[PDB]
Symmetry: D3
Subunit: 250 residues, 6 copies
Amino acid sequence: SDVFHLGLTKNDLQGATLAIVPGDPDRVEKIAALMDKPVKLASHREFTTWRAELDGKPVIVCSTGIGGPSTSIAVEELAQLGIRTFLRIGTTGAIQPHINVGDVLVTTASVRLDGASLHFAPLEFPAVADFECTTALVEAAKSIGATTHVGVTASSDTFYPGQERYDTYSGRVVRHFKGSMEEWQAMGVMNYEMESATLLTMCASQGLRAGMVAGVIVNRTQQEIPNAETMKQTESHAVKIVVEAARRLL
Amino acid sequence: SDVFHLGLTKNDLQGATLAIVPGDPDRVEKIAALMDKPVKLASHREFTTWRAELDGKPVIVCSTGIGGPSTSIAVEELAQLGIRTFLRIGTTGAIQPHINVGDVLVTTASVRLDGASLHFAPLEFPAVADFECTTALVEAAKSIGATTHVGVTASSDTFYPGQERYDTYSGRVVRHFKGSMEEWQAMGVMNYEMESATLLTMCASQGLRAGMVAGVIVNRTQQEIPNAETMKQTESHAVKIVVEAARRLL
Amino acid sequence: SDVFHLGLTKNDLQGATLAIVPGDPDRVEKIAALMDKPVKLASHREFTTWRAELDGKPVIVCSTGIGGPSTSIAVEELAQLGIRTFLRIGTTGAIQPHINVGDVLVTTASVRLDGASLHFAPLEFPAVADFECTTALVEAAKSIGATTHVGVTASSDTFYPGQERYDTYSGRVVRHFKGSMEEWQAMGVMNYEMESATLLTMCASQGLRAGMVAGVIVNRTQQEIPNAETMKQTESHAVKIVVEAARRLL
Amino acid sequence: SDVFHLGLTKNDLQGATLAIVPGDPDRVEKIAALMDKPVKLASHREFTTWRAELDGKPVIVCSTGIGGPSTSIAVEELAQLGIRTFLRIGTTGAIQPHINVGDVLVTTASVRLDGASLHFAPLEFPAVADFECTTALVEAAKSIGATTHVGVTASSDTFYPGQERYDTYSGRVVRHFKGSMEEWQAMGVMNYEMESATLLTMCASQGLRAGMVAGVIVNRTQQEIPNAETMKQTESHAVKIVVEAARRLL
Amino acid sequence: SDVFHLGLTKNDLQGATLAIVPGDPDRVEKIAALMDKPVKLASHREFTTWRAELDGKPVIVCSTGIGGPSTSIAVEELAQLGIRTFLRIGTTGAIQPHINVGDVLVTTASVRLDGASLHFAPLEFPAVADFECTTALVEAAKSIGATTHVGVTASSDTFYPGQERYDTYSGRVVRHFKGSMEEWQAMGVMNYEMESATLLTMCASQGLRAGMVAGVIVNRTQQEIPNAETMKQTESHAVKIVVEAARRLL
Amino acid sequence: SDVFHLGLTKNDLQGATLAIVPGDPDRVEKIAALMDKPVKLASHREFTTWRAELDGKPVIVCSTGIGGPSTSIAVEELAQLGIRTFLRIGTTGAIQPHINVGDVLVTTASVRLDGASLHFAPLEFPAVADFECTTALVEAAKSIGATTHVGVTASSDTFYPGQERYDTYSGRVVRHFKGSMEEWQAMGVMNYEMESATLLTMCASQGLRAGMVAGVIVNRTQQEIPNAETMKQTESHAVKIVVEAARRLL
Ligand SMILES: [K+]
Ligand SMILES: [K+]
Ligand SMILES: [K+]
């Protein structure tokens, strides 16, 4: 391999310069299957990589795992291999009452509640998305009639205390995160997830283009028993949106 | 007056909800005169306010003075009077070799080298522009033929040490800022100015829309004797862009 | 002009080494008019400058605008022109019940709730006034029988959230400033204003002498309808005190 | 499943209270096979879990993935299922000249170069190992004849800039981390890895026992072409040590 | 003297490489008297030094005074004279209900609520004890049947506000320390004292071995009138434990 | 005793409200003997206390030991016994070329390179002296003919790395303090010592008056073999000044 972790050579990419980067290794095949000539390249640790073709051009699909540290390894090693544009697709929990399950969120910039972003730029630097990527995601969402919200996301190194969850082993949250969800809500923040602060900071500070889209599967502000069906449909629409955005960025 | 500093009543605004916010009080009349039925409302301290009409709708032009503290007063008191969209117009100095004098810069987000932004949101929150305002500024720049750069700006509470200037009384820069210009250059930052970190943070955290455009009149990386005519033309260029963007946001 | 913003040459100063620096461009003429041979030198942006003569010696009066950033520009450019002593005169709101409207405050040092001070010295460095300037202000206050208080001032980059005001567009204050006024009150702090942290830090860290005096026009701790008359009288006494202090420092 | 990510019920564990936690999901089966009656329980994302029996008692082996965020999910959800002791096993790169490839490292505490540890305790709290777990790991290492070093480890949210690697896409390291490797070397730090600051802080602050052992496969201070056989043998050595330590902690 | 403060020459030590370091100059003679051939060397400021012999080998006993600053002077100057192992003995107040008066505490690492530790290593570095010293203290405690607890200690630059005491001149505690005792209690912290953060950080970052033991004389969580007798007995047992640990470290 | 550490009752003080606070317990008797009817009250740890009479009024002399932690105990327990004015006397090393051995320094405020000051007020609060105490010290210095410097002091929790000394066991200084002495020199700081940041912050934030004077016995910027007689004379000079200042503050 030409890189330390992903198990890829530059020849494997066949000249690709764009990658779609989901979190779950199990979701990579689903995304690749929407495009032409899908081929599995490698599977090592949390990093599963396929290649496919979109309008005659090679594109990469590679999983990051959960969190900024493993995300930073995938993005760096793909950059070493020639990738210059990175599109993240995820699912997410909204923290605003006006945002519904089934909706799509496009992130303009993120609240940096992570550690890895600091290894690229000091805290004062914005975790901001690329303008061309954000534009392509909004236009792709419109092309299939999705209800879309555009704005700021909170990006946390934990699933539990950093998202103010109390249903845990200890049942408590450290002082600095107590009351934090209500503060982000007042400041207009749409949602929580765990990788965008790292992704957006490391790309914007190194001349790489990045964008971020997610489907809403749950809402933290109103109690409701989730419906597995609505949730599956919502992930499928987010995947088509990221693929269509990619088409506009080739 | 209905507000503490600006010397304005809500009746004076005639229902306006958009304001163009330059820094220099002597620039307010020149911007207002490009639109219909311009009238002076007030002048107190660094805050000079005119009203005009664009495509039949009232709009405000109001100066901020230099720095985030006076900016924060103007934005708050305008919001008290009904303004919900804020467009900053300026001229600026570039720190990248590929950006030329006469070019136009549209800011997606800012590095927070200020104090007032912290009084609205903690450092981790992004100083990010509104997507609709950024889109209007970019599309207006293309409509008149400008060469445009879109990206990150460094926003400083000083003109001298925070912009790493050594041609000063002391000729010294505090440790924290020594070597800072070269760091921002490596990270792709386009330019320095002094009000956007405050403006963009206070608006993004309070449900108000803001954007920012500026004309390039000097470049810190290439020695050149300034041309007064070229600099006047560049200012006029940027002002035409901010008025046309306002037209798209009514 | 020999400087970038103020529109002054060194010859304009006629050998002056002391400046009185109020905030409001409109108040500069009032101060100059107490002295001999007053002459207007320049008006650009928030910076209005006059010259006059005190006991046969030239003195400068120059406005700063509101906030540390514009203050830092005026102080630097005046230093480039030969000024070595800076005396600030303002009006202010007290936060202690024993301090009355009509009283005069002389500041020994300031709480650094600003951004520009950090561009001169790290936070651990004290925003302390010059001992000779503080002495001259206290003695000048005694010479006209003013009721005087000497101590610490809190210096904020905002008028609204940083001074814990809730009568605003949003009606809220960021976590770190919630409860802050009561903490400063317990620690003996006399008042809030917006420029002294910057002024005192940048002078004490660069071999320049600075002092600070203000008249009390309002008290945050007891509700009362302000009297425009008492307020005008109080600003007039503070102006005579700063002029008399200057006389003792030539 | 009784937990959100791991895909496990409490019944699956058969009363287990100790878990061995490697990073790589493909290493879970190899560790479990050294013990009696090994069986696969689940595999979801980077989390692969097996059960086995040691001296008649059930034990769990569960992968964390790379970085503190995914580590924090595995540790929390295992604790929800009844686990109270956590033993980390890895391979690593040394930064001291006297430490040789083939040696074993036991960590007493870690330098916190991560984000997730802050979500459990403020920076001032020590990322310290449990004394009983450290004692068992040291005594097990001596029982099989390993050359062992006991001391402090640097635990980083990145593989590249946080470990001061320059052989990258950008070839740059942010100011804060320039010269950092030489500082840690002078302070006696043995090595870099990426999960221990999170693991040790979250356990020490919540009444859970944790320890950490690793085999040295490379040394950053001496150029050497790696030997694949030597590296495989070193991994097997460290795994035998972590199983024997578990035997002492039942 | 060969050093600035302690009044010692290297010859005075007769080849000693281990020191026992209590806080109170008055307690040095008591410790020395348990060993062979005790001799008083010097008394200057808070620094009183004796020499004695343990199993035929010279050992030093030297007081630190109260706090990290004076501790840092004693440790440095003893290191200049050849000392490489440092054992602290103290008395302390427990903050856990299960810990009783009469018990002995051995500290694995400390919460850094001091200033001097930062002059040796940044905050992220752990204030961790040496593994051989901690082992010797635990084994010495067992040899006389003491009830022993092993874990984390909070180490404060103050006796009053930093340990959340309200029975003071002012009757208040600064915001950041309000509620702090209950947070440390929840995180498993055993006790407060005032020198171990400095001692453990400066030794672990400079190749010196250090450990820490204390007798419990009071418990912050249950009201009780202290018994001078139980307190004297408890200090005597801690002194024998430190002497016996030293024997195991020669 | 009415207090925990000092071994004093309120009756012992005979109504005293002013204390002179040297660092060295062996200096307490020498200061007290310059006044009338001197008597020893107590000696415990680094705290030695005498009473004497000045112009018919009782005054206290009490040692602090080295560093802010022991200083904070002495000041708190004296305040509990009725003391409201605190005068620090010391000898010190200058860091400016124009300051000579034999000169006297009066401190207006201090750089906070300590930990204990943070336990009373956040870093942004100024470590500033009382104006009445500073005035008395300056006027007393002039009355006896001393060459006096008035200004800022750097106050450090260490004698060695925090004062950028390299003549040590390790010969290293942590990154944060490398190049620090030259920064403070450029900023006009006169000298280093180790207790004033704590003393001045705790008093200014609690309604207590404090000041500080010191005699210069060495200069870090000019190599010179110290003269023992000159150094003894300089100490006596500073002590005469602090007694005469006390006389003016009764
Ligand atoms: K201004
Ligand atoms: K991961
Ligand atoms: K001490």
